[PDB]
Amino acid sequence: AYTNSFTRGVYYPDKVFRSSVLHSTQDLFLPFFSNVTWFHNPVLPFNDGVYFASTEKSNIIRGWIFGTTLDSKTQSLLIVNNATNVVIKVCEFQFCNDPFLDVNCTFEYVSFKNLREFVFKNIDGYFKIYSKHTPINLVRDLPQGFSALEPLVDLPIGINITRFQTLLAYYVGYLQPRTFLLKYNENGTITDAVDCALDPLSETKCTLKSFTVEKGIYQTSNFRVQPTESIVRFPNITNLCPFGEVFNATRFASVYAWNRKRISNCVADYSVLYNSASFSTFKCYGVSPTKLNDLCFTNVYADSFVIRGDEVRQIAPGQTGKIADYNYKLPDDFTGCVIAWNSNNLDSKVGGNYNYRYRKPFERDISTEIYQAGSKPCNGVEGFNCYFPLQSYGFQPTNGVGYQPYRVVVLSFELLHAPATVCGPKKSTNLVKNKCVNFNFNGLT
């Protein structure tokens, strides 16, 4: 059974005096002329918050219970008017919903011709109550008229309420985020209100911030045709990308002769990388790693080598040092991801592994010519200030962490410009035409 809510259920939104003024406010409110359910009890959802009312002059309706379960397993609100007081606690109560006559505990508190009305809401970790009582002349539907509800209680309790029930005629409706214009009189009371979304005249009243509007034409709003459906258009590839051939390659290259693998014509899944506990670092520049599965790329290039753990900080745009200045450089506008891990469990050897060595953007140079560090034209002869250009990392299993070998992979992304060839795992839809749609072509949303 349902009933029209009329202009019921407005409350003082803040503890502020205002007078002879119209105030525009946004809050969880009961929308005007909404459908409010009627009852003569069941457990009910709490949703965003509740407006509750009853015909009452008897205390046949003793109170309310609230929580997730509203029963035993966790803290739950019990509220009862026992005629001596309002009695409140938030305990893990196991008792049944029939304590009344036939007519832990982390917080506790104590304090027909008539209708009694209430609002319950739970915001910023605090549980709030507002109320009113009035004489009336109809029991079978809510009174058509205006009366603002004022606050009672504001508990610090933090409970994640999702359900409630009545304890033994009564009416229930749900609050929604809406904008209202409230009329404060000379003595600080709300005396009238406009629900701005109710109709185009209420939009006009709220646009003007006035309860009357003159003859005329007023722009109140903007109109758009909305999307009927969501379309995804991606290349029809099913081949998975060979990332194991990069991240689990048997031998990694030197930092001076870093190795490049092209990745192409495949469906990638970067979650297979990003979810892995294998990586000591994982950082992305022009993209966030959480977004990678939504994208598609013309090319992906994996560049990889082994390097000393303390130096791994140089594998970023804008850095400088021996590895960055002589071995390998990213451009300072780099779009991609850098990944590395401590590889002392594989790369080291007891004499220091002599195979691993160090000396514009994306340059590589393997030339063996001597560093002529001195004024001497060294002419292929080593000596004071005449040295072979490569030096070796002393990678042995006993090394301290900054001196250990680390394995490095850098993924460089060629964006969508030409038709793309490496995509995330997005399922293509059928194509729809002449209707308004949301769309996604290879990541172009």
Partner: protein
């Protein structure tokens, strides 16, 4: 068209032409009188006699020369048509109203292509590529 719109005028061009027609028909049939009350009819050769007294030329000068004065007028309105038919650049004042508004809207639209120092000039790139904490800065 990125939230830009053009609203129509209230008076359409056929309504503006009905007003210039009414002004011109009042002027020809009644002289200045329709501006100071109700229109009072007067013969056009007799309205021009009052226009001649208004410049300090005695009104017999018009009637003694009426066919000459009428031909000098009719020939002068011929030259207006030839001038406007030849020389569209006479309307340079009105055409600059059109050109200034077109330049202003083209500059407003072209400024959507600018980065202003963000990752991209395109808002859907930023929202596709970056997660919320990083995207808000762009």
């Amino acid at each position: 068209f990125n939230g830009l719109t053009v609203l129509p005028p209230l008076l359409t061009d056929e309504m503006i032409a009905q007003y210039t027609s009414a002004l011109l028909a009042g002027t020809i049939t009644s002289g200045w009188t329709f501006g100071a009350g109700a229109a009072l009819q007067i013969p056009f050769a007799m309205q021009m006699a009052y226009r001649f007294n208004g410049i300090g030329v005695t009104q017999n000068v018009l009637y003694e020369n009426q066919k000459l004065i009428a031909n000098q007028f009719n020939s002068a309105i011929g030259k207006i048509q030839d001038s406007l038919s030849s020389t569209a650049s006479a309307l340079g004042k009105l055409q600059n109203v059109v050109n200034q508004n077109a330049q202003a809207l083209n500059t407003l639209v072209k400024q959507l292509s600018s980065n202003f120092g963000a990752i991209s000039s395109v808002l859907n790139d930023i929202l596709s590529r970056l997660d919320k904490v990083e995207a808000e800065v762009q």
